[PDB]
Amino acid sequence: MYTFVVRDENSSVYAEVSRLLLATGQWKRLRKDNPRFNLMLGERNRLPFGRLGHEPGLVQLVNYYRGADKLCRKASLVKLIKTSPELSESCTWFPESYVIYPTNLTDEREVFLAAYNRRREGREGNVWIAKSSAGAGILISSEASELLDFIDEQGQVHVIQKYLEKPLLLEPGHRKFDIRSWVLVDHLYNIYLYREGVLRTSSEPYNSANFQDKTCHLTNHCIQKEYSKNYGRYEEGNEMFFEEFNQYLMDALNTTLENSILLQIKHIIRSCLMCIEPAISTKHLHYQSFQLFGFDFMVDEELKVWLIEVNGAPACAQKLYAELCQGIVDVAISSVFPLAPTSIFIKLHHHH
Amino acid sequence: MRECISIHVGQAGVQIGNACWELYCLEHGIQPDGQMPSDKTIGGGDDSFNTFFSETGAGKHVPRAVFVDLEPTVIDEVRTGTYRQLFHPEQLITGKEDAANNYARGHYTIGKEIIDLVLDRIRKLADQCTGLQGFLVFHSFGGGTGSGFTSLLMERLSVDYGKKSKLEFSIYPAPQVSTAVVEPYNSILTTHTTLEHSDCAFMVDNEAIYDICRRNLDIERPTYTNLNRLISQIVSSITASLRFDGALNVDLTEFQTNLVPYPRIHFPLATYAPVISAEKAYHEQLSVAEITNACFEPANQMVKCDPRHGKYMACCLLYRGDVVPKDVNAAIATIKTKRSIQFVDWCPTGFKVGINYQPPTVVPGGDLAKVQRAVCMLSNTTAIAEAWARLDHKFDLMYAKRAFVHWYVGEGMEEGEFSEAREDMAALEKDYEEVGVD
Amino acid sequence: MEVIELNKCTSGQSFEVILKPPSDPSLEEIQKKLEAAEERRKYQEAELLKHLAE
Amino acid sequence: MREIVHIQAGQCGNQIGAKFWEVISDEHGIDPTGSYHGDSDLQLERINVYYNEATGNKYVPRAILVDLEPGTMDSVRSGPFGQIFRPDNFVFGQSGAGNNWAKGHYTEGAELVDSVLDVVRKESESCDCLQGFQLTHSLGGGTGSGMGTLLISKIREEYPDRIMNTFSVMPSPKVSDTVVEPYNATLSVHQLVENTDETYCIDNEALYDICFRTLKLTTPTYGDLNHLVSATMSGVTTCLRFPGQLNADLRKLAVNMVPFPRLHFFMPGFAPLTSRQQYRALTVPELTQQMFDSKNMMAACDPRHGRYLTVAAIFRGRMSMKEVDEQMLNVQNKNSSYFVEWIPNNVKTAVCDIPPRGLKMSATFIGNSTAIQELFKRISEQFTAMFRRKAFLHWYTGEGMDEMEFTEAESNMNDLVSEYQQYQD
């Protein structure tokens, strides 16, 4: 009889996992503060890692990699890519980004203007986007004055990166989109990619001459469902799944989702996670870690894949909660705590 | 030559002291009768080993040690053990009834009535010192004597030896080798009243010694003898510089200078390798780089924690055996390019290295195998704060209900001394976070 | 990767490697604490015997 | 030399106490004449904890036999090991206590208490360092209950900083001598709440059910019930009588078993308990499954009704200490809903190599459970069923007691119940 605790009631994902665990009749839930546990579905912020693995005769497993925030923070990811030799500053799949602290607080302000002035003089597209992790608070603009002044009005660190002016548009619609890929890393540090991804599409035609109305530029499921008037027109919930998107690439572009997009996505996931493995690995640790990640990608008109951000506590598409959540109990929980296919994941082999 | 006086308090300190002085003798060639044939200066001399051993006209080499226990059972082992001849009766002090795992009992009730006695016996060893450096105090956190009486002794040593340095070897409590439920209380009470009286403290988590014995030594149920023989190897590595010719950590002052830039943060993490089972017919002898790399593995740290998620303030590498500086710097270079070693921005990113050509001595019939080279890394990491967090959390669980508090109040302690001690630990954890986190 | 302060002797040698540069209570007060706790013990025991005497 | 002074009082106290000395005297090699004849030094290691050493290498128990009538103690003196008890340590009267708490506590008992304390003082003065006292007695009679608790009050006055321990047999209507047992027990339980550090609650009903259902004894007898008490007493004291570092010294045990001064009433348990399939070997899992099972617990309380404040287990015999830890850590990690989570690691385990006579290995259970309140609830109810009608009070008012003292004992135990209740939530 295994035991587990739940310290994040707001997690729709692990709410289902805990629901499935109890359904197995071999997992017993304990109070959130009971230290005798096998599996901790931990809180998002300030998870007490230092108290794990100190219970005699209990192999303890937690659902967050300590230190993985370096990848799931806007500013942290930028610092990780520019300073990690495995990713290098010349990383070809990450937009040119800079860390800019508000003037009311190192900082890359002068470094940003330098590359900005270079584009302005070279007749090149000079549209940047500013954002932060303390937002719902995003601003798209082509003038450096507006971008910097917007950050100073706030009080948290921000990131200014190149705005993809030539995004791949779906037809009919002429509309932007992004791609969400769920990736599960187990205690052995195998990188599993969920065979099911989702396209969070914009129901508004992309307009390159008006970044003020951000309804056709930001493909967030909450923005489309609040400030977009064509929500759900082309697909249910502005969510296209791999089957449909794949057939579209074939009919329109005469290619497949695997060749044109999926190879680059799988390469980016590998590069990012392998980079930080020495820092977060629990191979020789007194406890074990696994975690679910949500990668967000952009695709331009040349079918090049760009990394946007990585989410540490991602949600799931309603249609894929059952398949994935069970997939989490199979490779992440039951792999260390076995019970008395055709995997739904794609193993990304690598050198540890 | 300046002398160092060792003080062992409680059962843990006394049994651990036994293992150390057994090892010290095998290292310096001192027989159980106190005789040392290699010492060509009979009944005198200011050699490096004279920092820990005094001499008599008869040529006996006597440890500069004091054993103190509030019960006679543990210290009686020394009086009739293999090294009974090393010490004289004055050096061993025993009471009638112990502290019953009650800090307040060892510090107040019983301590008040025997405190001045330990001091008098210590004064006697000090009177043989022409330049006393300071004291090395061995004790446990969980015991009533180890916790309670130790903090009282430290308060008096600071009074009776103001300018002298005081180091600790402290046993952090581990449920796998403990039957006391109140050890969190005692540990936090003794750290609060000892913090401003200790210049450098080497915490050893029984949980870590226990696992190293099961994993590396293949001991299914490690005994105290197993735990102490291994703890004295680490202690030997740390005190070796004071007992052998050298230039690194030659006096107790250098330990604070090289390892403790901030006074309250005086708890270095110890890491030792290799620990090899003697039952193995023969083992592939490890290299300088391999044993050095092992210093950054959680599995051989004296306190289980993740240094990858802290900031180093200092770092000493203490090698014993076949090791030349060339090999050390080569391994360090590689370890930097693969390991996550983040220093605090107000401290240099460097390593002080000490090499003693004599490889680690192994107690005949012990559990450890003879190896050609070993190393002990002393690194002051903010990651060790994980140990304070675990302990302070257990304290909060019980104290919130006032469980067991009546035992401490009944021995004369006021309840407010609990929260006074706890708020000091809250301030200690804040100091670690300000120094290590961003 | 600099080596400094190399000291060698017959029983070993010691050196330093720099990878990167940077960026009490008086005796009187102890007896008072001790005696204060001894007084509260005497008081607590006095109330016990008074309880037993009743 | 941490000596313990033993006292046994009344019919129940002296019969259980006798079997106890019979059991441990065997485990230490002491024969009925006090001569050692064992084959292991471990037998004599801590022998002085319960035995004085006389001339000619003789070992004399440190026990004082007390009763207000001669009958029971006369039997002990003629019993198996009767000759091993110090002759002077028999202190007894002739009147009897008539199963009357008042007679043992205020009148008859008071006339004899001073002479008993003269013997205690005599045994104490001989102790290099007295750990404390342990008393055996029932609470439903008059001498062991009434005078027994009078002795504790006085022993505590003369030795305020020594540990006071008792094995207290609790009455049950299923194993009852007289109807006033709830009266005597409610009066004693308040004394114990004040003046004992540790009290092992031993319900005669649990003992009876164990003899009928588990041991398959058709017609149980006090003798049969006392076999269980003998074994249990030998078990819980193993920590003291042999070389060990866990639970040794009564004060250390009290410091780790008593989180609050008044909640110091323990539930004991023993395993195995086999009916005569008695030669089969008992595995470590079985020992642990039974030792924690309610049908092996001698308080007559269902632990699954409350929560464990602390637990102390003692395993005896040559077994896998690794396997001991695994099975213990399995019971806890399989039923952590019954252990209070505000006392980390409140379950401790100790191993001993010497087993009881005729057993490859056994386990003794020592639990400070809030379920014990069910026991005080029973007594409280049986008490009030009569006291509300003042039934049988004349026996007590005729010895100088007032109804007020009953109303207070009542309220004092209902308070003790509410205390156990608040720590169960």
Ligand SMILES: Nc1nc2c(ncn2[C@@H]2O[C@H](COP(=O)(O)OP(=O)(O)OP(=O)(O)O)[C@@H](O)[C@H]2O)c(=O)[nH]1
């Ligand atoms: N490593 C190691 N730990 C020990 C040893 N002896 C006791 N301990 C630990 O010390 C703690 C108990 O404290 P003790 O040292 O036994 O207590 P004490 O200092 O003798 O004081 P008293 O309460 O009066 O007995 C437990 O956590 C034990 O695990 C030992 O020999 N080696």
Ligand SMILES: Nc1ncnc2c1ncn2[C@@H]1O[C@H](COP(=O)(O)OP(=O)(O)CP(=O)(O)O)[C@@H](O)[C@H]1O
């Ligand atoms: N450099 C860039 N070029 C083009 N579009 C961008 C961009 N940066 C952000 N976006 C747009 O913003 C959206 C994602 O914003 P971002 O992920 O930074 O905020 P967020 O984290 O609150 C949403 P989520 O975490 O759910 O993906 C995408 O739909 C994308 O179209």
Ligand SMILES: Nc1nc2c(ncn2[C@@H]2O[C@H](COP(=O)(O)OP(=O)(O)O)[C@@H](O)[C@H]2O)c(=O)[nH]1
């Ligand atoms: N377990 C056990 N209980 C007993 C024994 N003798 C009496 N009792 C119980 O003790 C109570 C009577 O107390 P008793 O010892 O006879 O009174 P006393 O001699 O005046 O102290 C009743 O509840 C009996 O059930 C015995 O030998 N063993």
Ligand SMILES: [Ca+2]
């Ligand atoms: Ca000499």
Ligand SMILES: [Ca+2]
């Ligand atoms: Ca000082």
Ligand SMILES: [Ca+2]
């Ligand atoms: Ca009379």
Ligand SMILES: [Mg+2]
């Ligand atoms: Mg986000």
Ligand SMILES: [Mg+2]
């Ligand atoms: Mg002790």
Ligand SMILES: [Mg+2]
């Ligand atoms: Mg009777």
